[PDB]
C-alpha cells in the first residue's frame, strides 16, 4: 500500500502542476509591462529607537499606528512610542531566547515566545501599575517563531515543532493545531477578516489554513530553501514570502501558483522579513546583507534600499495607517522610516 | 497635551535608569551555549560544575551556559540565535568512535556558519577514561574508522598524562588533530578553538571555560582597540 | 518543489560495483553543496559523502574513503555516487541531502526524523 499511495501522490501532484500551468494563461510582469515604474523612493531614519541591550528579532505595530513592541535577546520587551522616542514600556522576559512578539489589535495584551516553547501573554492594562505575566500557553515542542493576535482571546502561533497553535487565552488550552508542515514553521500571517492564514516552514512551502476549519486549504511550493518572512497583501488574495535563496515570491490564494519573483544576481543573501505598503504596490524586504530592500511588487524592479543598520536586519513591520515602516536589526537598534 | 507628555518623559526616565541598571548586570555576566550530542557527558560537564541552564561563578566572574535540548533534530533556526555568545562549548565522546564522524560534521557547521563564524569553540574531548580503555583493549580499532589514524605520528608538542600508554596519547591526539584541522582550514584568525581533555570525574573544567573565555575577552579586546 | 529522485541501487554480492545517480529538480543544483547520506537497518541515519558547489571540495567518511567516490555534474543537474568495492556492512538505504541554504560551507542534513530536502533513498543491499 505504500507504493500504492506514494504513485498516487506523484499523480495528485502531476495533476496539479498541470492544472496550475493551464491556469497559468499569463504572467503578471507581462500584464503588469503596461504600467508606469514607481521610480526611486527615499526613505529616511525619523527616528533611531535605541535602547535595546542586544538584537532584536520581533517588532509590531499597533493598531493605532503610534506604539510598536520590540523584543530583543536581552530577554527585553520594549514597547515604544514612535512619535515621541519615548520608551512607554519595558517587561523583563523569564527567558532571555525571544524569537517572536505581537501586539494585539486591543492594544491591551502583547505576546511574547522563543526557545522557552512558551507563549507569555503579557497583560498591559493592569490595574496594579506595572505590566504582569497575564498567562502562559505551552503545549508546543519546538521554540516559538511568530506569534499573532486573532482578538483579545484567540491567538495563533507557529513553533519550530512543524505546527502552528489556534490558541483561547482564558482556558489556556490549544483550541486548534495545524498539522502538515514537514519543517519549521518560521513565519505566519493573518488575513485582514482573520479568517485565513498562511504560515510559512523550513520545507520551501508555505501553507493557507482556515482557522474554523483547522485544515490545510492550500499549499504553495515554488521556493528553494528555508522560508523565513511571510504577509498577506492587503487585498487578503495574495501573500509574499522570503527565504534564504536570496529571493522573494509572490503567491495568488485563487490562482493558487506564484506570480512574480523578485531577485537579483548580486543578491545572495537570504530574506528575513518582509512586507507590504498600506496600498501594497510596494514590498519592503529585510536582507541578510543589513540593508533592506523595497521593490515594485507589480513589476519585480527594486525602487528603493534602507541602508542604515550595521548588522542583519531581522525585523519589519509597516503601520496600519501607513505613515512609517519600522526596521530592527541585531545591531540593537530599531529605526522608523517614511 | 504637555501635561501627558512630561508623565511620559518621566516614565521614560525611570525605564532608561532601570535599562541602564539592566545593562550593567547584563554586560558584567557572560553566555556560553553549550553543544554536544547523546552519550557525551555535557550533562555531566554541567552537574560536576554545579536543565536549560546552569550558572556558575569563578573568579568573581559569572558565567550562565544554555543546553539547549527541547527542541527537534534540526538546528539552524536556533543556532542562529546563540552567535552574540562568548564561547560554544562543544563537548564530544572520544571513545565513541561510530559517532566521532558526526561531531566533526556537527563542529564543521558550527564553524563555518556564517553568524557562527566569529564565536570561539571550547572543545571538550570527554570520557578520555573510556578512550583509554578502547585503545589498551584493542578490540575497536581506530583505524578502521579513521584510516588515516594508520599514518599518524604523536606531535611533538604533546603533553601526555605520567604513566601512559602512547598508544592512548596517538589516539588523543588524533582525534584533537581532527576537530583543529576543521578548525584551522577556515578560521581566519578571527575565531579560534580551543580543546581540552576532559573525562567524567574531571573537577576543573570551570577554570579551563573561565581561562579560555578570558584568552577570547583578551583578543576580542586587542581586535576592536587597534586604534584607542 | 525541491526534489531529488534516486535511481539504481539493488541487489549485489561483496565486492560489486553500483553507480547511484540522483537527479535533481527545483532549484539551482551548482550553488548547493549535495550530499550522500545512508541509513542502516536498525540505526539512524549517517552522513557518508558529500562535494562543494564545483566540485573542488569533496570529502568522505573514513569507513567508505578509498571505495566510494562522489561528483556532479551541473550542466545534466545530477549527482553520482560510484560505489566500489562493496561491503556488507555498506547496506543502507541511500539519500541525496542538498545543504539547507546556498553559498554556506555549513550543512544540518542529517536529520534522523525528517529533513526537508533529502530524497526518497534506493536500497543497497550486499550480501550472497
Known amino acids: 500500500e505504500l507504493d500504492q499511495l506514494r504513485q498516487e501522490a506523484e499523480q495528485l501532484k502531476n495533476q496539479i502542476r498541470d492544472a496550475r500551468k493551464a491556469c497559468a494563461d499569463a504572467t503578471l510582469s507581462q500584464i503588469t509591462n503596461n504600467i508606469d515604474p514607481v521610480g526611486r523612493i527615499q526613505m529616511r531614519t525619523r527616528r533611531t529607537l535605541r535602547g535595546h541591550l542586544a538584537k532584536i528579532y520581533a517588532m509590531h505595530w499597533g493598531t493605532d499606528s503610534r506604539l510598536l513592541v520590540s523584543a530583543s535577546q536581552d530577554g527585553k520587551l520594549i514597547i515604544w512610542d514612535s512619535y515621541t522616542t519615548n520608551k512607554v514600556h519595558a517587561i523583563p522576559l523569564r527567558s532571555s531566547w525571544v524569537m517572536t512578539c505581537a501586539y494585539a489589535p486591543s492594544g491591551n495584551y502583547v505576546a511574547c515566545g522563543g526557545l522557552d516553547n512558551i507563549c507569555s501573554i503579557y497583560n498591559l492594562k493592569t490595574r496594579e501599575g506595572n505590566v504582569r505575566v497575564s498567562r502562559e500557553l505551552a503545549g508546543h515542542t519546538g521554540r516559538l517563531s511568530c506569534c499573532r493576535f486573532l482578538d483579545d482571546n484567540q491567538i495563533v502561533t507557529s513553533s519550530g515543532d512543524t505546527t502552528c497553535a489556534l490558541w483561547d487565552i482564558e482556558t489556556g488550552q490549544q483550541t486548534t493545531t495545524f498539522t502538515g508542515h514537514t519543517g519549521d514553521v518560521m513565519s505566519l500571517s493573518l488575513a485582514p477578516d482573520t479568517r485565513l492564514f498562511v504560515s510559512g516552514a523550513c520545507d520551501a512551502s508555505a501553507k493557507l489554513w482556515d482557522v474554523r476549519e483547522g485544515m490545510c486549504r492550500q499549499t504553495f511550493t515554488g521556493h528553494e530553501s528555508d522560508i523565513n518572512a511571510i504577509c498577506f497583501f492587503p487585498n487578503g488574495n495574495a501573500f509574499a514570502t522570503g527565504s534564504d535563496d536570496a529571493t522573494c515570491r509572490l503567491f495568488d490564494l485563487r490562482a493558487d501558483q506564484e506570480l512574480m519573483t523578485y531577485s537579483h544576481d548580486n543578491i545572495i543573501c537570504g530574506i528575513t522579513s518582509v512586507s507590504f505598503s498600506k496600498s501594497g504596490r510596494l514590498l519592503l524586504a529585510g536582507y541578510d546583507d543589513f540593508n533592506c530592500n523595497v521593490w515594485d511588487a507589480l513589476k519585480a524592479d527594486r525602487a528603493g534600499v534602507l541602508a542604515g543598520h550595521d548588522n542583519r536586519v531581522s525585523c519589519l513591520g509597516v503601520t496600519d495607517d501607513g505613515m512609517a515602516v519600522a526596521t530592527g536589526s541585531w545591531d540593537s537598534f530599531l529605526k522608523i522610516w517614511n | 497635551q504637555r501635561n501627558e507628555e512630561k508623565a511620559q518623559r518621566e516614565a521614560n526616565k525611570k525605564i532608561e535608569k532601570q535599562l541602564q541598571k539592566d545593562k550593567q548586570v547584563y554586560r558584567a555576566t557572560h553566555r556560553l551555549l553549550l553543544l554536544g550530542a547523546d552519550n557525551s557527558g555535557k550533562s555531566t560537564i554541567v552537574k560536576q560544575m554545579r536543565i536549560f541552564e546552569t550558572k556558575f561563578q569563578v573568579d568573581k566572574v559569572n558565567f550562565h551556559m544554555f543546553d539547549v535540548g527541547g527542541q527537534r533534530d534540526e538546528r539552524r533556526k536556533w543556532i542562529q540565535c546563540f552567535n552574540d555568545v562568548t564561547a560554544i562549548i562543544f563537548v564530544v565522546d572520544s571513545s565513541d568512535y561510530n559517532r566521532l564522524q558526526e561531531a566533526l560534521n556537527l563542529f564543521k557547521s558550527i564553524w563555518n556558519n556564517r553568524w557562527l563564524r566569529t564565536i570561539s569553540v571550547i572543545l571538550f574531548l570527554n570520557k578520555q577514561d573510556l578512550l583509554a580503555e578502547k585503545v589498551l583493549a584493542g578490540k575497536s580499532k581506530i583505524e578502521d574508522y579513521f584510516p588515516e589514524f594508520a599514518r599518524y605520528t604523536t606531535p611533538e608538542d604533546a603533553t601526555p598524562e605520567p604513566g601512559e600508554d602512547p598508544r592512548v596519547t596517538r589516539a588523543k591526539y588524533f582525534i584533537r588533530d581532527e576537530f583543529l584541522r576543521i578548525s584551522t582550514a577556515s578560521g581566519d584568525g578571527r575565531h579560534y578553538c580551543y580543546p581540552h581533555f576532559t573525562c567524567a570525574v574531571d573537577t576543573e573544567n570551570a577554570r579551563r571555560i573561565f581561562n579560555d573565555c578570558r584568552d577570547i575577552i583578551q583578543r576580542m579586546h586587542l581586535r576592536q582597540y587597534e586604534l584607542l | 518543489q525541491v526534489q531529488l529522485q534516486e535511481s539504481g541501487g539493488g541487489l549485489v554480492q561483496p565486492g560489486g560495483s553500483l553507480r547511484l545517480s540522483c537527479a535533481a529538480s527545483g532549484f539551482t543544483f551548482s550553488n548547493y553543496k549535495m550530499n550522500w547520506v545512508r541509513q542502516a537497518p536498525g540505526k539512524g541515519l549517517e552522513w557518508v559523502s558529500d562535494i562543494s558547489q564545483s566540485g573542488a571540495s569533496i570529502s568522505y567518511t573514513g569507513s567508505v574513503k578509498g571505495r566510494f567516490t562522489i561528483s556532479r555534474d551541473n550542466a545534466k543537474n545530477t549527482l553520482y555516487l560510484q560505489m566500489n568495492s562493496l561491503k556488507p556492512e555498506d547496506t543502507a538505504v541511500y539519500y541525496c541531502?542538498?545543504?539547507?541554504?546556498?553559498?554556506?560551507?555549513?550543512?544540518?542534513?542529517?536529520?534522523?526524523?525528517?529533513?526537508?530536502?533529502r530524497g526518497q533513498g534506493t536500497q543497497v543491499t550486499v550480501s550472497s
Open positions: 541531502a542538498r545543504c539547507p541554504a546556498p553559498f554556506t560551507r555549513d550543512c544540518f542534513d542529517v536529520t534522523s526524523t525528517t529533513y526537508a530536502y
